[PDB]
Structures are given as C-alpha cells and as structure tokens.
Scaffold this active site. Structure first.
Site, PDB file in Angstrom:
ATOM      1  N   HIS A  40      61.491  48.859   4.109  1.00 43.88           N
ATOM      2  CA  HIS A  40      60.831  49.113   5.388  1.00 43.88           C
ATOM      3  C   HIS A  40      61.725  49.911   6.352  1.00 43.88           C
ATOM      4  CE1 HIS A  40      62.613  45.310   7.086  1.00 43.88           C
ATOM      5  NE2 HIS A  40      62.528  45.995   8.213  1.00 43.88           N
ATOM      6  N   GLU A  52      82.051  50.533  10.964  1.00 50.31           N
ATOM      7  CA  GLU A  52      81.658  50.333  12.354  1.00 50.31           C
ATOM      8  C   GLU A  52      81.920  48.924  12.866  1.00 50.31           C
ATOM      9  OE1 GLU A  52      80.846  52.320  14.576  1.00 50.31           O
ATOM     10  OE2 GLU A  52      79.506  53.934  13.898  1.00 50.31           O
ATOM     11  N   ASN A  54      81.847  48.503  17.153  1.00 48.85           N
ATOM     12  CA  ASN A  54      81.012  48.943  18.261  1.00 48.85           C
ATOM     13  C   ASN A  54      80.303  50.231  17.857  1.00 48.85           C
ATOM     14  OD1 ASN A  54      79.995  50.075  20.731  1.00 48.85           O
ATOM     15  ND2 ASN A  54      81.338  48.657  21.837  1.00 48.85           N
ATOM     16  N   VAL A  57      80.914  53.333  20.264  1.00 51.03           N
ATOM     17  CA  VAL A  57      82.273  53.796  20.548  1.00 51.03           C
ATOM     18  C   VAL A  57      82.964  54.151  19.233  1.00 51.03           C
ATOM     19  CG1 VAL A  57      84.527  53.164  21.574  1.00 51.03           C
ATOM     20  CG2 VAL A  57      82.431  52.289  22.586  1.00 51.03           C
ATOM     21  N   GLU A  62      85.742  54.490  11.317  1.00 48.41           N
ATOM     22  CA  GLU A  62      84.422  54.939  10.889  1.00 48.41           C
ATOM     23  C   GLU A  62      84.474  55.991   9.795  1.00 48.41           C
ATOM     24  OE1 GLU A  62      85.456  55.079  14.146  1.00 48.41           O
ATOM     25  OE2 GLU A  62      84.037  53.860  15.302  1.00 48.41           O
ATOM     26  N   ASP A  84      60.899  44.505  -0.915  1.00 50.25           N
ATOM     27  CA  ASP A  84      61.428  45.205   0.252  1.00 50.25           C
ATOM     28  C   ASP A  84      62.894  45.559   0.038  1.00 50.25           C
ATOM     29  OD1 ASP A  84      61.667  46.357   2.743  1.00 50.25           O
ATOM     30  OD2 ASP A  84      61.621  44.467   3.851  1.00 50.25           O
ATOM     31  N   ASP A 171      68.937  32.976  13.913  1.00 49.88           N
ATOM     32  CA  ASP A 171      68.150  33.802  12.996  1.00 49.88           C
ATOM     33  C   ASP A 171      68.635  35.239  13.060  1.00 49.88           C
ATOM     34  OD1 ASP A 171      66.025  34.461  11.195  1.00 49.88           O
ATOM     35  OD2 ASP A 171      64.476  34.152  12.708  1.00 49.88           O
ATOM     36  N   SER A 172      68.224  36.040  12.086  1.00 53.16           N
ATOM     37  CA  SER A 172      68.285  37.490  12.235  1.00 53.16           C
ATOM     38  C   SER A 172      67.067  37.945  13.045  1.00 53.16           C
ATOM     39  CB  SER A 172      68.361  38.192  10.874  1.00 53.16           C
ATOM     40  OG  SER A 172      67.282  37.825  10.033  1.00 53.16           O
ATOM     41  N   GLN A 174      64.876  41.778  14.922  1.00 52.40           N
ATOM     42  CA  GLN A 174      64.679  43.226  14.962  1.00 52.40           C
ATOM     43  C   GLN A 174      66.011  43.969  15.106  1.00 52.40           C
ATOM     44  OE1 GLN A 174      62.104  41.222  16.572  1.00 52.40           O
ATOM     45  NE2 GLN A 174      60.801  41.830  14.853  1.00 52.40           N
ATOM     46  N   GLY A 175      66.204  45.005  14.294  1.00 47.99           N
ATOM     47  CA  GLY A 175      67.449  45.767  14.294  1.00 47.99           C
ATOM     48  C   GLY A 175      68.456  45.300  13.255  1.00 47.99           C
ATOM     49  N   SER A 177      67.287  44.409  10.307  1.00 46.74           N
ATOM     50  CA  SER A 177      66.558  44.874   9.124  1.00 46.74           C
ATOM     51  C   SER A 177      67.430  45.646   8.156  1.00 46.74           C
ATOM     52  CB  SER A 177      65.415  45.791   9.539  1.00 46.74           C
ATOM     53  OG  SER A 177      64.360  45.066  10.113  1.00 46.74           O
ATOM     54  N   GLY A 178      67.363  45.274   6.880  1.00 52.41           N
ATOM     55  CA  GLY A 178      68.080  45.980   5.829  1.00 52.41           C
ATOM     56  C   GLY A 178      69.496  45.502   5.601  1.00 52.41           C
TER      57      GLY A 178
HETATM   58  N1  LIG Z   1      64.567  36.911  10.628  1.00 56.08           N
HETATM   59  C1  LIG Z   1      63.655  37.348  11.386  1.00 56.08           C
HETATM   60  N2  LIG Z   1      63.024  36.498  12.194  1.00 56.08           N
HETATM   61  C2  LIG Z   1      63.277  38.803  11.371  1.00 56.08           C
HETATM   62  C3  LIG Z   1      63.858  39.689  10.468  1.00 56.08           C
HETATM   63  C4  LIG Z   1      63.508  41.035  10.459  1.00 56.08           C
HETATM   64  C5  LIG Z   1      62.567  41.516  11.361  1.00 56.08           C
HETATM   65  C6  LIG Z   1      62.196  42.950  11.353  1.00 56.08           C
HETATM   66  O1  LIG Z   1      61.920  43.514  12.402  1.00 56.08           O
HETATM   67  C7  LIG Z   1      61.983  40.634  12.264  1.00 56.08           C
HETATM   68  C8  LIG Z   1      62.336  39.287  12.269  1.00 56.08           C
HETATM   69 CA   LIG Z   2      82.166  52.777  16.295  1.00 56.47          CA
END
Ligand SMILES: N=C(N)c1ccc(C=O)cc1
Ligand SMILES: [Ca+2]
Length: 223
Positions: A40, A52, A54, A57, A62, A84, A171-172, A174-175, A177-178
């Site tokens: 995705h 990486e 920061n 910066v 890097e 995915d 939790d993980s 948005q951002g 992802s991957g």
């Molecule tokens: N772990 C989650 N809640 C979670 C993981 C990835 C996304 C993708 O936008 C959204 C939520």
């Molecule tokens: Ca950096």
C-alpha cells in the site's frame, strides 16, 4: 508510533524512510540492494533514505539512494490488504556499516507472545495529529490469531497477524506504514493496517513476513 519511546539515533539500522519529496512510509533493508515495505506504500519516484534519525535534518549518517524498481506482491489486494508486501530495489548498493545494516529474514514464523520492536516516523497521537522528526520505537507482543480475528471479524487472513495491546494506548499509526516488526533479530512483520491507532480492542495488523520468504528470495535472485 503512539505510546512508544525515542529509539535513539541509528539504533534501528535497518529502518528506512521512503521519500517522494517528503517521508511517506517506512521500510526495512534486507540486503545492500533491497528494501521490504508494504504494497500500500507503492508509488513511482521513490528515494530510499537510510541511516536516518531526524528526517528533517542532515545529521551525517544518511545515504539517499533512488529506487530503480518496485515489485508489488503478485497477489496484493488493495481492498482487503491481503498480501500487503512490496520489494524495492536500490539504483546503487548501500554501504553497510554499524548504522546502516540489513535485517535477517525469518526461517520460521513467530508465535503469539513473542516480543517485537516496531518502529517508525508516523503519528504519535491516538486522537489528534503530531508527527515526530526522530525515529520512534515500541516494544509489543504478537497477539493470538484467535484474539486478532475476534478484534477484526471477517478481515484477518493467514497472511496477517496482530501485535500490540488490547487495552489501547500503544500502537503503530499513519506514517509507520511499511515499517518493520522485528522479533529476536528477524523481520516478522510489516506495518499494514488497523482501525484508528492505539484504540481499545483494535490492535495493529501486520503483514506476516514468514509467508513470503520464498517469494522474496526468488524475486531478489532474478531481479
Ligand atoms: N497499527 C495501526 N493502528 C495502523 C497501522 C497502519 C495504518 C496505515 O495508515 C493505520 C493504522
Ligand atoms: Ca536526517
């Protein structure tokens, strides 16, 4: 990452940022030429950023390397997020050192209860929005398949697992992802999806990397 901690600079040496003018996804370096991320996260014009901390910066460790090719899993379904996973080849090989290093692929699947490290530059708020500049980390256990399916009726395939905390708060997001879920030094998961972030009874859902090792190895061997 919601409810995590600051990793520390270059302490997660396999973590990459995928950049298309801005950070948009995480990924995991699996050898000098290849990154694993979520399907995705596919887009054209990816620059892979290694070493990486920061992301806003230039700090001195890097390596910025453009992608030469992306390969989305042949069976990726963007509606269900089944399969995915995607591979990204670098135009030139990364220089591997203590701060930029590959992560091992699993030889067997992990078990519910195994402690893992999840990392990323995604949103740190469960209600609002705040994006960190430095890499964030979360230690979280893999959850049972039964609790995962109970949390998300009709949605969990054999290529997914849940990890985190049913109580919410960690939790993980948005951002992220991957990005990587690493357990005992093996890449077992990829940040995939979830309902909101850090919500009660809505743990993170992750691509089950162990199911894809054969595909990863054969794809790399011929590309
Ligand atoms: N772990 C989650 N809640 C979670 C993981 C990835 C996304 C993708 O936008 C959204 C939520
Ligand atoms: Ca950096």
């Amino acid at each position: 990452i919601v409810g995590g901690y600051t990793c520390g600079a270059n302490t997660v040496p396999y973590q990459v940022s995928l950049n298309s003018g801005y950070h948009f996804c995480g990924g995991s370096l699996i050898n000098s030429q290849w990154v694993v991320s979520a399907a995705h996260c596919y887009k054209s014009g990816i620059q892979v950023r290694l070493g990486e901390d920061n992301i806003n910066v230039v700090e001195g460790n890097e390596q910025f390397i453009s992608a030469s090719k992306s390969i989305v899993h042949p069976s990726y379904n963007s509606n269900t997020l089944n399969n995915d996973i995607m591979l990204i080849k670098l135009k030139s090989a990364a220089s591997l050192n203590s701060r930029v290093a590959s992560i091992s692929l699993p030889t067997s699947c992990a078990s519910a209860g195994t402690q893992c490290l999840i990392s990323g530059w995604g949103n740190t708020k469960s209600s609002g929005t705040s994006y960190p500049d430095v890499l964030k980390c979360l230690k979280a256990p893999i959850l049972s398949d039964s609790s995962c399916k109970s949390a998300y009726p009709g949605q969990i395939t054999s290529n997914m697992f849940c990890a985190g905390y049913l109580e919410g708060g960690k939790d993980s997001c948005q951002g992220d992802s991957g990005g990587p879920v690493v357990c005992s030094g093996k890449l077992q998961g990829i940040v995939s999806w979830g309902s909101g972030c850090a919500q009660k009874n809505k743990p993170g859902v992750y691509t089950k990397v162990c199911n894809y090792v054969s595909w990863i190895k054969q794809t790399i061997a011929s590309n």
